[model samples]
Every structure is written in structure tokens, then in C-alpha cells.
Target: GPILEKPALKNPTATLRRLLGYLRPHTFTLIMVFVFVTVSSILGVLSPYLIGKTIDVVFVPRRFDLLPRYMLILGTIYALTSLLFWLQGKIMLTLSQDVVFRLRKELFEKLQRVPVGFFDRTPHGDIISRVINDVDNINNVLGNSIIQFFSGIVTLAGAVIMMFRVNVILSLVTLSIVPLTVLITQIVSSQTRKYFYENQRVLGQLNGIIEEDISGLTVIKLFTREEKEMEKFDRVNESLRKVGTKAQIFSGVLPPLMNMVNNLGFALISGFGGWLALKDIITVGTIATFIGYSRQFTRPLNELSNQFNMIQMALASAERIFEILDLEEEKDDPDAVELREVRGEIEFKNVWFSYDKKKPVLKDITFHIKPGQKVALVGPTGSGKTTIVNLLMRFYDVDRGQILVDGIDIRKIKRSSLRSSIGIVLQDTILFSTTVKENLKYGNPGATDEEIKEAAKLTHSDHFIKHLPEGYETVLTDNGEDLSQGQRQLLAITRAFLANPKILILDEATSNVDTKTEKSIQAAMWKLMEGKTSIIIAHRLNTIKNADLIIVLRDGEIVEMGKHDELIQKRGFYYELFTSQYG
Candidate 1:
């Protein structure tokens, strides 16, 4: 459950600055948006003035002929205002799309480069949420709220300027509500922002639960834990609902509270404007104009308050996304050599390693294998057998000492180059939702159809594959769930065979297959191992009897090492492991 924990929001000002950095590339387009928004807002402000002019210059004066000209001017201003608003929308839409496109691409590329340990500790669904939902939130803010925020400022300023010009005393009355509006917004927004962040965290957790449950639905059903699972989901669902409701309640109060303030401002403007008119300091036309400007002023303030909530949501999402982007990536040595034509002579010189610093997985482990040697690692579960394999592959680097391939330190070699030179077949096979032929060629994408077929034939998977409705073209979904475990294992072996790596690692590769299939796969493996170095991890002790060297481990140390028969003759740990499985 700790693995599903989401990141908390950090440094909003810094996050906002980073978010704006994305807009720097489209400076020209952003400028155009600002220009259009300003023009539109200014034109909108002019409408009240024109309406007041129509009252004073045409209607009150009884100039019927001037009414047509006044109407034409008002209509043109309204039409241009509409056009400018449309143009602002069009520009902002494109700007948002471009910024999000680059953001998503950068996030994906960062995921590829981040250390495997990050994924090991993080839930897959949480990562997916950052990439999809969080990015979309930012997109919505940029496309809609960013323009509205700027326009609101301009509208508020223009309306205030016109109000002061009409009557300074009435303007002061309208402006009095401004401080109250600010105070309300500050209180409500601070509370809503807290809930918004919590809501995002709960949503990510909910997603993780659903993803985990759905992926393991078969196991859950087999155990008949449907009710238990439902209880777990209900708990998370209820938490989400509570948090979401709180966030909505806080955000929802802003518009109405601001509206009440706006109406209060409206009533004050009207009452005071009438008084001023009666005193002959302002005319009826000026009163009408000030009322329109008062409404115009408060509308943007309401929208700006609403936009504050939206911006908080976007910034919260950005902080989560940027947290991932800021993680230290797996670094390769600058002078790392390219491993070409590896001979597969691997050695660990007093190597020590641990996933967590406090508990050592492998301690002072020393081993050496010559080219073409078939070494078997035999130990109980959690005895550091697989840890040795992980170290050799550089999934986790050694804490002390070094691993060398062909007398060169593994740390001196590029990770991609080292991995390319090695092929691994694991007990748990992973097949994508694609054709059988494509899955076989995954390790070696350039493999021809003939090569794919040859690899399949070598692994004895050709028979079942041929019987399928589509043969090599058959698509496997749900990670090849339709196929039996043994069939999936065979496909995995075929994929490794296609890779033809200089060094091969088999982590109980035959564990899933039945006796008959194991025999066929073993034959294929023996042939494939010819003149290539192979490290085999076996729990089925019978499989490694002929290994060139068998290293038995207990805890994190090597307890026994010799040929299988020689070690068995000694009646040590290897012999105990051997008879326990075979006797």
C-alpha cells in the first residue's frame, strides 16, 4: 500500500514557473492570444459607454436621425468583439495542444530512462495517472483558464477606469466589495486546494486498486474472495467520494458567494448613482452607464475566482508530473565501452549487493565461469541465486567489488550493449497482445519470418503454433492467457533463442512446462547452449546434473561449489538440495 502513495504538492510558485516554461517555445502564438483577448475585453467595455451615449445623445435629445448612426456603431463594436473572442479561442486551443504534445513526449522519454527501481517501487496505475489524467488537467487549464485569467484582469481594469470617470463617489462604493471578494476567495481557495490535492491522490490510489484487482481477477475468483475484494474496493471508493465532495463543496461556494457580492455591489451602485443624479452631479445616462460597468467589473471577478480553483488543480497535477521528471535517471558511464562480439566469460570478485541498504542479498559472493561454461546456481528461495543473475545483468549494481565480462568491468560497458549481449528466459513469461510471429521476434526485431519459424521449431513450439487457426499470425491477448503455461514458456524460450545472445540466463525457464515438454525444451536448450556461456537457476535439481559447475548458496554466501556429481558426493548443502528434490 505504501507503494501506491502519491506525491504531495510542493512549491507552487516553482511549479508554476516550470509550467510556464512550456509556453516559451510558442511565444509568438501566446502573444497573439494576449492581443486578441485584450482587444475583445476592451471592445466589451466600450459597449456600456456607447449604450449610455445612445441614451443621452439620441433618445433624450429627441434626435431620431442620429439613432441609426449610434445603432450602427454599437452593432459594429459588438461584431468585432465577437470575432476577437473567437480568434482568442482558436489561438489558445492550438497553443494548449502543442504544449501538451511536448509535455507527454518528454514524460514518455523520461519514463524510458528512469532507473528500473523507480518502477519497482511505484504502482503502474499511479504512473499511468500522471501521464494521462494529470496531463489532461494541465491541457484544460492552458486552453481555457489561461486566456480567461488574462481577459478577466483586463476587463476588471477597464470597467474600474470607466466607473471612476462616471462618478468617483459611486466608484468607491462599488470598489468596497473588492476587499470582501478577495478575502472570501483566499479562505475558500486555501481549503479547496487542500482537498483538490487529496482528491488527486485518492483517485490515483483507486486506479491502482482497480488495475491490480482486474489483472488478478482469475486468482481472486478461484479463491472465492469476491466479497472481500468488494469490501476493499468499497472502502477506497467511499474515501474518494468523501474527498471529492469536500473539494467540490469548497470550489462550488466561490461562484455564488462572489455573485452575492456582485449583487451587493450592483445595489450600492444603483442607489448611489440615483442619489448623485438627483443632486445633478450625474445625469440618468451616466447612472445607466455606471450600472452596466459595475456588472461588467464583477463578472470577471467571479470568473477569476473560479479560474483560481482551476489553476490550483492544474498546478497540483503539474507537481505530481514534475516529481517523476525530476527523479535521477539510470546513468551510464561517459566512457562506457561498446560490448561487441562478447565471449561471455563472466566473473564476480567478492561482489556484495542489496536492494535495501540494511539487508544484504548477496555478500562476498565470488564466482568465475569460462567461455562456454554451463554454470548452475542452486539454492532455496531467497538464497541470493536470482540476485546473482540480477547483478550480472546490472539491473542492480554491486555495492562492492565488480562484475566482469571478458575481463572488462560491467560498469565500464554501456547498459544497452551489455543487455544486448545477454538473453534471459524467466519463469514468468510476458507476451504482448500481438501476433505469435511478432512476439517471437521481440528480442530480435530484424529476424526474418524464416528465422522466427526456425526458432519456434527449435523450442518445439512449432506443433502447437501450427495447429492455431492463424498459425504465426494468431494474435494473443491478455498476455497469452489462452495458451497453457507450458505453451507460454515455450514461446518465451523461442524468443530467447531468436536473440542468440553471447551469454544466456535461464531462471527456472523449464519450471512451468510438464515433464514431456521439459524434456523437449531441455534438448533445445542444450543445443542452443553449444559454444555459448549459460547460467542456469534451477530448483528442480535433476536438471543440472551435468552442469560444468554447480554453486550452492545458503543465505547470501556460497556454501558449496563443484560439479554436480562431485558436490553430491560431498554430502553438503548441494547434496541436501539434490536429495530433497529428487529422492
Candidate 2:
């Protein structure tokens, strides 16, 4: 449900700085944005001035001669404004795309490098929302708001300058509402932003639910938990609606509220300007010009208030994204060695581990598998059997002690090299929607077609594979549903064979197949492990009776260790585990 979510980022200044750093590569384009926005906004300010001039010079004097000329000039200014505005929009659209392109790329790469424990804790759907949805929110801020926001500032400044210059008395009266208007916007903005933050967070939460529902729909149906699932979705969706409605209502208030403020400024100017004319302090033309600047000033405030609302939304999303980018990625040892030749010898000495800090899953786990030994690791669920395998894979490194392969600490080896040398065939096969040959070559992309076929043949993956409608070229359905469970297991075994690693891990690899199918897979597996160090996590105790050694575990410690016959004679933990199957 969570992806490093915390209260709104405490340091907006630092987050804003980091966001600006993305536009560092586009400095030249930003300069063009500044120029276009400046010229366009300056022209926008000039339009009211020119219209005021038409009133004073032509209309008030009843002089038709200058009317046509003034009209032509005003038309030109308006036309030029549209052209500059379009050009500015064009540059910002492309510029924002370039900026977000890098941000999205970095986010995706960061996910790849972060530790597997991050995924173990975070939901996949929330992660998806951040990458696609949250980043797009940031994109909107850059493209649409960045272009208009600067122009709003320039127009507001220009109008302020002209308003004071036209008449101080009228200007002060018109500006009286400015402080109160700002105060109201600030209050409204705080509530609006609060709702926006909740909206984004709840949206991510909903996404997590939808993702789990889609992937686990079959399980939900079989278990008859669909009613509970619907109720759960309704609860989350209702929370989303509550926050969204608040965000929308608070956002809707700003524009109209600013509109009422602008109208109040208009009435003040109209009354004061008319009184000034009565005293011969200013003319009708001066009143008109001042009124134009008054409207001009508040228009930008309204526009900026709107942009400020969006800025709040973007900041919320940006903080979520930056939080992820700031996580500590899984790093390799600085001087890690390249493990070119794995002798397949593995030893776990005094190793302690835990997914969370407080609960140690594997306590002082110690074991040794000599090269070419087939060791069966047996235990009840939650008794640290798979935790031992996890440590070997380096998915979650041990909290204490060391795991050595070929007399070298596993930590000292490059993860890329160590992982590539150890092949694993999992219990439930995971296949992408690709041809059978492509799936087999997933672990070793460089394997020749001949090698693929040979390994498939050796693992008994060739017989049923050839009888398929398209043989090796068959495109699989979701997780290879086109094939049966035993067939999928055989395909998984074939995938492991293509790697041809020095060490192999079969983590209850045949647990799902029926006994009849298990024997065939076992024979194929025996041939595959003929000369490799292998660890078999067996569910069926009888199947591993011939293992070179039996390491029995209880809780997080190794309670007994011996051969099948040796352990049976002692009637220890290993023997008790054996008796459960045949007792």
C-alpha cells in the first residue's frame, strides 16, 4: 500500500531546486520562453493604454481622422500578441516533454536498481501510478503553467505601474482590496492543497487495489471472495470521491471569488474617477484608462490564482516522485570481484537475516554444500528453509556473518556475476507471452538455437514441445496457460538448463506436479544435476531419500544434519519430518 509515502515533503525549497535541475539542459529554450512571454505580456499591457488614448484623442474630441489610424494600430498589437503567445506555447510544449522524458527514464532505472525488499513492502499498482500518473501531473505544470505563469507576473507588474502613473488617488482606492483578496486566496489555497495531497495518495491506493484485483481475479472467484473485494473497492473509491470533491469545490471558488474582487475594484474606480472629474482633477478619458488598467491588473491575479492551484497539485505529485528517486539503490561492493568460474561450493556460516529489522527470519543459519553435492534442505513452512535460499540468491543479504562460494565471500562478488552463475527453477513457473523458444532463452539470451534444443531434449522438454501446434514457436497465453501445470514445470526446467549454471536451486520445483508427472520431471532433473552443486527444497520427503546430505531445520536454526539412513536411525527432527509422509 505504501511507496516511501510520508507527510508532505518537509522541505519544499530543496524539492523545488531538484525539479529545476531537470531543466538545466534546456537553458537556451527557456531563454526563448522568457523573450516571447515578455513581448506578449508587454503588448497585453499596452492594449489598454492604446484604447485609453483612442478615447482621449479621437472619441472625446469628435475627431474621426485619427480613429481609423488608432484602430489599425490596436488591431496590429492584438494580432502580434496572439502570434507570440502561440510561439511561446510551442516551445514550452516540447521543452516540458524533454524534461519529463529524463525524469521518467531516471525513475524507471531507479526501480530496477533498488533492493528487492522495496518491492516486498510496496504494492505494484502504487508504483505504477507514480511512474505514469504522477509524472504526467508534473508535466502539466511545466508545459501549461510555466508558459502562462510568467506572463501573469509580467502583466500584473505592467498594469500596476500604469495604474499608479494614471492617478494615485484612484489607484490607491482601486488597490485597497488587494491585500484582502490575497488573504482569501491564501486561505482557499491551503484547503485546496490539502485535498489535492489526499487525492493523489488515495488515487495511488486505489490503483494498488485495481492491480491486485486484475492479477488475482481467478483466486478471488474460486475462493468466493468477490463480494468482499467489491466492498473493499467501494470503500477506497468512496474515499477518493470525498477528497476529489473537496479539491474540486475549493478549486472552483478561486476564479469566481477573484471575479467578484475585480468587480469591486471596478466599482471603486468608477465612483472615485467620476468624483475626480467633478472636481476637475481628472478627465473622463483618464477615468476610462485607469479603469482599463484596473481590470488588467486583476485579470492576471485571477490567472495566477488558477496556476497556483495547479502548482500545489504538481508539488504534491513531485514530492511523491522525488521520494522514490531519493531512495538508496542496491549498490555493489566497490571492489567486488568478477566471479568468472563458480566451483559450485557454497557455505553459509553463522548467517543471520530478517526482512524487517526486528524479527530475524534466519538465526545463525549455517550450512555447507561441497561442489557436486545434492543437499536436501527440509523443514516446515516458516522454519527458515526458503529464507536460506533467499540468502543464497542475495535477494536479501544476511544481517550477520558471511556466505561464501568457492572460498570467497558472496558479498565480495559482483551481484551480476554471482546471480548469473546460479540457476533457479521455481515451483510456480513464470512465463511471459512469448514463443516457447524465446522463453527458454530468457536466462541466457546468447544461447544458440541448437543449444536450446539440446538442453530441452536433455530436460525431456523436447517431447511434448514438438507435439504442440507450433512447436518451439508457439506463443503462450498469460503465464503459459496454453500449457498444463506439469508442462509449464518442464518448460521452467528447460529454462534453467539453458543457463547451465555451476550451481542449481530447485525450490520445491516439483511440488505442484502429480506423482506420475513428478517421476518424469525427477528423472530429467537428476540428469540435469549430474555434476553440479544442488539444493533441493523438497515437499515430498521420499523423493529426496538419495540426497548426498540431509540438512534439517526447526525455527531459524539447523536442528539436525545427516544422511537419510543416518538421520532415520537417530530418530531426530529429520526422521520426524520423514515419518510425517510415511507414518
Candidate 3:
């Protein structure tokens, strides 16, 4: 079953207020739109009155000499009205674009400040939908419906006043269907709102599935699950179609029904005006004028009925956008100190932590490393090796203990400063879609071509890079899909080298490279590790054999700690793990 959800907002008025706040910077243009729309609508209402005057006072009276004059006046009024309408559209377009620009800008910046865990749980496609699709929906409504909505109100009011001035009885008869139209709009819009909300939700789900399937295309093909993936997409796509159809069906009901009632009103006014004409209580010209006025009066009402649905959808989108804008952003302490130069000493004293408080991932972890010592964390898959890296980077905060760098609590150091002094190379390398030179210079944007090549050569990447079509300028696409896995890892290592940090972290950095390539990378890493405190997490026991200290972790606790030779002599868990892998 499809899971239907309502808009997150409980009070729509608040969402509307926040949306309007985005317009504050362009208040002058907004006011000008109001003036232009009002002028256009009022001028529009005057045309029917002049046509009736020309018929009764000029044509019927055989005053042909004045006919051309009245025609010229009517033409002038319509010409000016058209000009004002054009101006209104131009201003509204500018205003809507400016508002959307600020909205998208803020939404993007907000994402950068949010905690890493937010991305961990939320789907990438859903975030893109909110940033792009929902914002565009808001723009559409503001550009079209907002102007029409207010214009309809002014036109309706002006037409009604003119109708009563022409004939009270006919005006009463024209307005008789108004209550029924309101009732119909309210009922239909209420039902359609849920479907519109559901449609957006299902569309977001469809986007998520497409993004995941496309990103993992290699895995899907290797496992031969293309049919299964297609079936899953079909289910989500069908749900979107059904919900969209329901929303459209309900929203489409209003305009035609309002038109039917409007046509019936037109008939009533024509009959009533004709009777008055027969009794000599109104001129034939007056009857003709009332018919035109009745049509004009009911038209804006019908339009307002149609615009009601657009307004509802905009509000729904606005609520979704506001929900993200309201999220709690990650904060840095006001008293935090900046580390201008780091000595690379690190200590974790009685650290305890969990992603979810109910299940602990790291427990009572205690360790220390001197300024230039190399420490290795060796453990099973579920151990806390990666969690320690996360804590050191402050991607997450430890729940129950302190992490210190150079004897200063990490939380007391500015996050940017702390992260700037440390560099990491991960098992899964990520390279942006850009030139090879730019990827190497990412951490140090000021690096020169000579420096970039120096770093690349150090990692043994310069040879392959020099062979490419554009040499160092060769553009990589989608994490360098054209490059081999080992080549990508080489670029990642070159990038970390360019950073030139005081502390280094290698989390299975050489796992993807073949033995031949691994040797080159390992040699490069040994030079990079000199004069820096380094923490290495490795599954292959051979990589960390010469570390100054090796900590063995299992099930969130360090079960053994010593030099590699000493641990081997103990013939314990580390010995068992080493023999199993080596054998």
C-alpha cells in the first residue's frame, strides 16, 4: 500500500507569513504590481459600460455623428488596459525570480551547515526535489496565480458595483449562484489537497528509486536483478500516476461546473432584463449592457474558483520547504579556539559513544599517540575503528567522553581549524567530475601546477595522467569512471598529499589497488607518514606490521595492545586473526 502523508505544517498561516517574508527585499516592485493590476482591471470594467452607452445614446437616437468619437474612446481604454496588463506581467516575473533565487540560495547553504547524520538518513533525491521541484512550484504560483487572484477580486468587485448601478434586479439575479459556487469549491479543494500532497510524496519516492538504481547500475547488472528493479520502479510510478490522476480529476471539476452555473445565471439575467424592457422600465441598450455586465461579474468568480487549487498546492510546497529551513543547524562554540599550528598529538580517554543511544558502538576506548608516532587499529568488521575516525573529525560528537588533540579538548577547538590540520584517505575514493589538476588541488586550492605534479608523481599517478589526452588537464567524469579503481585511489592519495596535514588517517586506503599497484602506494604512504602522527585501519595484517603501536579491537573494546612482534608472541586474538589471513 502507498503511504499517504499530509503536509507537515499544522498552521498554514505561519508558512504563508514566512513565504511573504522572502518578498520583503522587493517591496517596491510588489506594490507596483498591485497598482498595475488594479488599473488594468478597472479599465477593463469600463469597456462594457461605454459600449452600452454608444448603443442607447448614439445609435438608437440616430446620433451617428458621435459614434466615431465613442469608438475612439473605447479603443483608447482597451489599449491602455493592455499596456498595464503587460507591465504587471513583467514586474511579477522579476519579483518571482528574485524570490526563488534567495530561497534556493538559502536552502543550499543550509544543507552545508546541517549535521552529517541528516544526509545519512535522508534520500538524496528527496532533497533535490525539495530544492528544485518544490521551489519551482512556488515560483509558478507566485508568477501567475497571485496576480490573477487579486485581479479577480478587484474585477469581481468593480463588475458587481457597475451591475447594481445599471439594474438592481438583474444584479441580484446574477449573484444568486455565488453561495453554491463557494460551497462547491470548498468541498472539491478539501479532497484534492490530500491527493496533491500524496502526488508530491510519491514523486519524491520515484526519484529516490531512480537515483539509487542508476548509481548502482553495475551491481544490478552483475547480480542480474534488472527485472526486479524494473518491477519496483513500476510500482512506484503507477502509484504516482494514480494519485496525480485523482488530484487532477478533483481539481478539474470546479471550472466546468462553475461555468454551467454561470451560463444558467446568464440566462436568468437575460430573461429578467427583457421583461423590464417590455414594461418600458429599462432601455434595450440597458438590457444589453446588463447581459454584458452579468457575464463579466460571473467570470472572475469562476476564475477565483480555479485559482483556489493553485493556492492550495503552493501552500503545500511552501510547507515542505519551510520544514527544511527550520531544521537545527550544527553549531560551533562561541569560545572555541583556533589551532594555528598543530603538533599532531591525540588522546582518547574513556571515550564512549553510539549512533543511537540504545546500542553502543564504542565503549571506554582509551588510547594516546605522540607527535610523530604511527598507530594502527586492527579489528573485526563490527569493531570501533571507523567510529574513532568519525569522532576525531567531529562528524559526530562523542556522547560520554572527551577527545583531545595536543592536550586541548577537540570540542574546544574550532571545527574548521581542527579538520584543516588532519587529512584522510578512505577505502572508497571519491573524485569530482573535473580536470585531474583541479582534483589534486582541491584541498589546497592555491597549489601551483608544479606542486600538483609533484604530489601526483609522489603517488605514482603522474605517469598515467601524462598519457591521457589532455595530460594533467584531462577531465574526469562521475568520480572518474574512465579511470581504473587503482588509478582513482592514486588520485585520492595525491589529493591528501597536497593537503600536507600534521596528522594522517589511512582507512584501508590501499584495499582497492592490486598487489603491484599497492606496493607503489605503500611506498608513497611511508614517506607521507614521516614526521606526522598517523592512524591506520587495515583488514590486511601485513600493512600495519611495523607500527609503533597496534591496538586490537573486538566488539567495541580493545582486547589487546602492543608492538606487532609482542602481540604475535602472545598467541591471542591478534595471532589468530593474523594466521587466518596469512594462511
Model 2 — TM-score against the truth?
0.81
Off by over 4 Å in 2: 1-18, 130-134, 183-257, 268-299, 302-335, 340-343, 460-483, 509-520
Per-residue error (Å), model 3, residue 513: 4.1
Q: Kindly list the per-residue Cα lDDT of model 1 for residues 1-583, writing each as its tens digit.
A: 0012234568789998998898988888788778888999988988998898899899888998999999999999999999987888888888899988988888898989887787877899877866798899899899998778888889888888887887788888878887887788678778777887888889999999899999999999999999999998899999999999997888788789878887887788778888888899887788778778665544567578668767777888898888878988887899998997867899999988888889888888898999889898888888888877777888788999989999999999989888878888887669999999989989897999898887788778888898888988989988898886777877888888887789998865644567877776777677667767989886554558778898889898999899987887899887778787788
- Backbone clashes (count) for model 1: 0
Residue 233 error for model 2, in Å?
Answer: 13
Query: Whose TM-score is greatest here?
Result: 3
Poorest lDDT segment (10 consecutive residues) of candidate 2: 1-10
**Model 2 lDDT, residue 342, Cα:** 58
lDDT of 2 by residue, 291-330 (tens): 7766565556757866876776677778878988999987
lDDT of 3 by residue, 287-336 (tens): 67766765554446657856766776788888888888898887778999
| Better model by TM-score: candidate 1 vs candidate 2 | 1
Query: Candidate 2: lDDT over CA atoms?
Result: 0.82
